[PDB]
Amino acid sequence: HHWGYGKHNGPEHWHKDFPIAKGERQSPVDIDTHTAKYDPSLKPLSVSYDQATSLRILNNGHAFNVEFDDSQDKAVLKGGPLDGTYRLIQFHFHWGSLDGQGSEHTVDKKKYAAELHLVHWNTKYGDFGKAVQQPDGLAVLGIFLKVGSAKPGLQKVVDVLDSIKTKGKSADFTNFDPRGLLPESLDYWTYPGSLTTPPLLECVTWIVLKEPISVSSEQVLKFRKLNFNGEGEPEELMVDNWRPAQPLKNRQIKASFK
């Protein structure tokens, strides 16, 4: 009886195995655009993905992860609210069963169709496992998806999904360029928070881009063909793998833009 997103093991149940679920800096949150304050001391974000080395794509039973070689400073996030250098380790998405839901963060209570998480760890902690034990261990770049025009840079991901339909399946996934997943503007909101899946550790500086990317209906439909179950199990479509907004508590969301 492990955690998931079903009727009986979903977000409202997680606190029983992971008490930090009701903690002081949990994610995601609703971004109230009128209450977020412009912080003129925030730097432009530095996204350096030109040397990114993707390796593999994995269905882990709750999302799919596109994994990167993070044994050197090849793809890094710096600047913005961050001190130091954060290495890209993986990206994944959260999405809905319908276009009206799927994102984890919300913007004035608006839910997007999906949300991309580019996960980075602080190199001062040496590796990912140590980093998640630190309050400034991770930087996650969050990007909203809306349904409209196709995102050409997403298509290579969409097309490999039939090869990783079920839990525990992986496929080689080299030479994927995550720059093709970025919107034009790097304007962002930022706040201190947590992993949005168990173990829900409070180790994340969240940087959520204001500008969503557009993906096509066909692209998101292919996400919804994935399975939470393993091969040879009853099919449970991988949809609605998002945690809802959590209480903001004693936190201020800062904006990089006026």
Ligand X SMILES: CC(C)c1ccccc1-c1ccc(S(N)(=O)=O)cc1
Q: Per the residue annotation, which of 2, 62, 105, 120 is the catalytic one?
A: 62
Q: How far is the CB of 67 from ligand X (least distance, A)?
A: 8
142/212 with CB nearer ligand X: 142
Question: Alpha carbon of 16 to those of 19, 34, 87: distances in Å?
Answer: 6, 34, 32
Q: How far is the CB of 254 from ligand X (least distance, A)?
A: 19
85/194 with CB nearer Zn ion: 194
173/206 with CB nearer Zn ion: 206
Round to whole Å and give the CA distance between 246 and 67: 28
The verdict on whether residue 94 carries a ligand-binding annotation is yes
The residues binding Zn ion (CB under 5 A) are 117
Return the residue of 25, 105, 111, 117 that touches ligand X, per CB under 6 A: 117
Instruction: Point out which span in 17-25, 170-178, 190-198, 247-255 binds ligand X (CB under 6 A).
Output: 190-198
Query: Which of helix, strand or coil describes residue 156?
Result: helix
Round to whole Å and give the CA distance between 181 and 140: 14
Decide: 85 and 72 in contact? Cβ < 8 Å: no
Q: Does 90 bind ligand X (CB under 6 A)?
A: yes
> How many binding residues for ligand X (CB under 6 A)?
8
Q: What is the 3-state secondary structure (H, E, C) of 59-80?
A: ECCCCEEEEECCCCCCCEEEEC
The verdict on whether residue 1 carries a ligand-binding annotation is no
Decide: 29 and 193 in contact? Cβ < 8 Å: yes
Vertex 49 angle, CA 46 and 50, to 5°: 120
Q: Is the backbone peptide bond immediately before 199 cis, with ω within 30 degrees of 0?
A: yes
42/114 with CB nearer Zn ion: 114
Return the residue of 47, 147, 195, 209 that touches ligand X, per CB under 6 A: 195
85/196 with CB nearer ligand X: 196
Q: Does 122 bind ligand X (CB under 6 A)?
A: no
Active-site residue flag, 62: yes
Return the residue of 76, 119, 157, 207 that touches ligand X, per CB under 6 A: 119
With CA atoms as reference, report the closest residue to 147 among 113, 111, 103: 113
| Residues facing 190 on adjacent strands | 207, 254
Query: Which of helix, strand or coil describes residue 130?
Result: helix
Q: How far is the CB of 94 from Zn ion (least distance, A)?
A: 6
Q: How far is the CB of 92 from Zn ion (least distance, A)?
A: 6
Q: How far is the CB of 195 from ligand X (least distance, A)?
A: 4
| Residues facing 48 on adjacent strands | 76
Give the pair of three-digit tokens for residue 98. 């319908």
Round to whole Å and give the CA distance between 11 and 6: 9
Q: Does 241 bind ligand X (CB under 6 A)?
A: no
Which residues carry out catalysis? 62
User: Where do contacts with ligand X occur on this chain (CB under 6 A)?
Assistant: 90, 117, 119, 132, 140, 195-197
List residues forming the annotated binding site for Zn(2+).
92, 94, 117
